[PDB]
UniProtKB/Swiss-Prot annotation:
Entry protein name: Protease 2A
Reaction it catalyzes: Selective cleavage of Tyr-|-Gly bond in the picornavirus polyprotein
Active site location: 15, 33, 104
UniProt function note: Cysteine protease that cleaves viral polyprotein and specific host proteins. It is responsible for the autocatalytic cleavage between the P1 and P2 regions, which is the first cleavage occurring in the polyprotein. Also cleaves the host translation initiation factor EIF4G1, in order to shut down the capped cellular mRNA translation. Inhibits the host nucleus-cytoplasm protein and RNA trafficking by cleaving host members of the nuclear pores. Counteracts stress granule formation probably by antagonizing its assembly or promoting its dissassembly.
Domain of life: Viruses
Lineage: Viruses, Riboviria, Orthornavirae, Pisuviricota, Pisoniviricetes
Quaternary structure and partners: Homodimer.
Full protein: residues contained: 869 to 1008 of 2193
Source organism of the structure: Coxsackievirus A16 (strain G-10)
Amino acid sequence: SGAIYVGNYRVVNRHLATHNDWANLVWEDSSRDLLVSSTTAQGCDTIARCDCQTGVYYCSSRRKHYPVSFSKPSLIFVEASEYYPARYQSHLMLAVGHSEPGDCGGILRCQHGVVGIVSTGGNGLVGFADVRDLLWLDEE
Ligand SMILES: CO[C@@H](C(=O)N1CCC[C@H](C(N)=O)C1)c1ccccc1C
Ligand SMILES: [Zn+2]
């Protein structure tokens, strides 16, 4: 589990969104595994606006933050799971790192701010849903 709290927005994995998230919906995209809902309180996270390919992510199944090198956001095949059928997920970045189901929502960050959240993984890989192209998260 986990979310990004920027301005009056809460960014979560679409597959882990709550009923309150759907009832306060701003934007969702199944192909990216992302959903954004509105918040009453202002958050403290800032979004990175850069092309970094190195950063640090939080792994809840280890209670640890790990440094990683990650690929550029791309269209990658993600196998059928209990949340989606076999499909291509867009804006996804892969890295070598530990991940389990329950680690989705952990933040990946670089020197400029938050880059994205854990969305996929297995067999010593971890995948992150990029948020750096969502410029509207910085206003209104
Ligand atoms: C099968 O679970 C993995 C996964 O890639 N999923 C499940 C959750 C939905 C993911 C998606 N974005 O389509 C696909 C998973 C997730 C995160 C970290 C480690 C794993 C092993
Ligand atoms: Zn950066």
